[PDB]
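Cross-check.
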Amino acid sequence: DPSKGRWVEGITSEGYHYYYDLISGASQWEKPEGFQGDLKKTAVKTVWVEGLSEDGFTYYYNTETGESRWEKPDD
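Predicted model, tokenized:
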């Protein structure tokens, strides 16, 4: 099934996430439509996404409404 998706995640100075493609051989930054493994359906992925900011602070964001958070939500 032609599509391709050989992207690797790498850490950069300060605290950024860069991606690279071995197929074509080019360094990228913007996450394409098919990264972070699978996405729902027979998988384990919550609604909130874990992000890294500052020296090493964990921030969470919601795709439902679109609001960033700075605390671990309860359930």
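The chain has no helices and six strands. The beta strands are 7-12, 16-21, 26-28, 48-53, 57-62, 67-69. Passed to J.P. for a second look.
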